Amino acid sequence: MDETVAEFIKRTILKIPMNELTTILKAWDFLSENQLQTVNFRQRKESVVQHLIHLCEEKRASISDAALLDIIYMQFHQHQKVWEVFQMSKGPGEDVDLFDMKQFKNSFKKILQRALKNVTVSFRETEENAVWIRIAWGTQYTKPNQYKPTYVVYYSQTPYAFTSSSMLRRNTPLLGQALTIASKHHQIVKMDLRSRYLDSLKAIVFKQYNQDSRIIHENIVEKERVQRITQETFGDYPQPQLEFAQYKLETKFKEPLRCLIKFSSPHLLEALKSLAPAGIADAPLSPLLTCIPNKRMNYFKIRDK
Amino acid sequence: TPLQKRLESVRKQSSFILTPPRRKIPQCSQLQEDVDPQKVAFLLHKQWTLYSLTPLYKFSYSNLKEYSRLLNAFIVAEKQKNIKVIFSTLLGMKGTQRDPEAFLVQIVSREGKVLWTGWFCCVFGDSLLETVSEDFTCLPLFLANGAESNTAIIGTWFQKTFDCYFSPLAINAFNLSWMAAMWTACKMDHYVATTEFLWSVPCSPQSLDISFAIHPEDAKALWDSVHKTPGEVTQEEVDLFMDCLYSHFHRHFKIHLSATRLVRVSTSVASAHTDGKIKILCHKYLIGVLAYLTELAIFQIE
């Protein structure tokens, strides 16, 4: 029920698919149980995106909760808008005895509006104990832009704070700065982990993923070996990186020979696992390629050694 | 002579007699005669989806307005099932003087929003001219870039009026590696883009793709390592360039790139895919890149 708010809600309501209309509209709380029956969710897309936004016209929707709608949309569509991983680092001392979600919301919004005075920061403390910050940016010269927001999934007391790599503007060093000063840390470092599957980045940065008689195969002693070495490097249930696992090679050919390798698969760490047994790869499959989760890194910048 | 010459050509091609085409490094093709600088420059950095086009029966480079109207009235009728069609002879996209002049087919929508911009060219394609009669103006190459829907409509119109048939030209990874090698062998300066080779491993469950993007000057110095005979690149030299890539990739990641297939070879000269959406023409070597592309289209036609 406002400029860049009502039509913003319209643009985020045609984004959400028809199946999970109830799921996202129930969680953002503006449509109570009585309001759900008024609109027939099963009829049409333009019908619902017109009646629902009217149901907020009577509900006088504001950007503070319109952005929360976008948050809840992305919580089920986090597998888009490839995510950078920021890693905080406190120095020597005790941990953050005060991460009050109210205090963190204050210490983040205050620092962000200290310089980026026109931003619509909207938090959503999820049930997995990970505040799902969404930031619509805009300098003092412009209104906060909700067209391209920068969602930041900060796990509540974790040194790691995922970030939607939207545009990587001059706010990115302020995104990390506000993040590391709201949560009582000192150094913000981009881990350089950049994947589209946040549910896999969560696994990686937390190490949370692993916790006939006639056909005489003459190279059976080699197939057994290659299967063995592909089970002590890729143990069980690898997580889908699905990311351009770059290897910006700077090595001499055996002065350097610059390369910018980009492994690109819908499911990378499983694609590598089925390489050596398929004959494409050697059995010891180059730890540069096996230690993507073990190093918690895929955007490599290797050199010679 | 009118057909039997083509039958003997088919015999020679199917014979497969010692093929390795030692190819001349694409020479700097100073833009011949007119070659409308605005038009050609507009035609360079556009991702042409190649097709193989059989010779057009009863075509003439005088009746461009009649074909323009006949096709415009057909495209908008396929919308019944706002658009202007401008056939435009390019006047310079030809290898030898006897080649048919390349001509465009642009779906111009109000303003000059060229939706489709078709392109038929026959450059250095004198393996088809000397085998087809005079009535056919043969342009083996067809270049789409517009949506596949409009291409699959203008192709139908061309089949209906000219008896020409569009097989989607698919550059096999062998020809792709060849062109990836002769384009890092060129004598260009100020390399526009890195020499990227998009591999795609043949895994059954998963579809991992590799972008072995080399620094364009670094690949030129790697090519000079395997380049010994000047003037012409051989199949062994191309294979040694590709094997130096293989022995710099399997060296690093222990996965045999030679066990994979090229899908796209981006180069400062011209990007080139496999599945058809192939020829981006970054530099003005397009009379040589198009020479290779037409020579490949003959392979599919003949």
Binding site: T251, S286, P287, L288, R303, D304, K305 | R251
Partner: peptide, 5 residues
């Protein structure tokens, strides 16, 4: 080392 073999 940085296993560049």
């Amino acid at each position: 080392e940085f296993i560049i073999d």
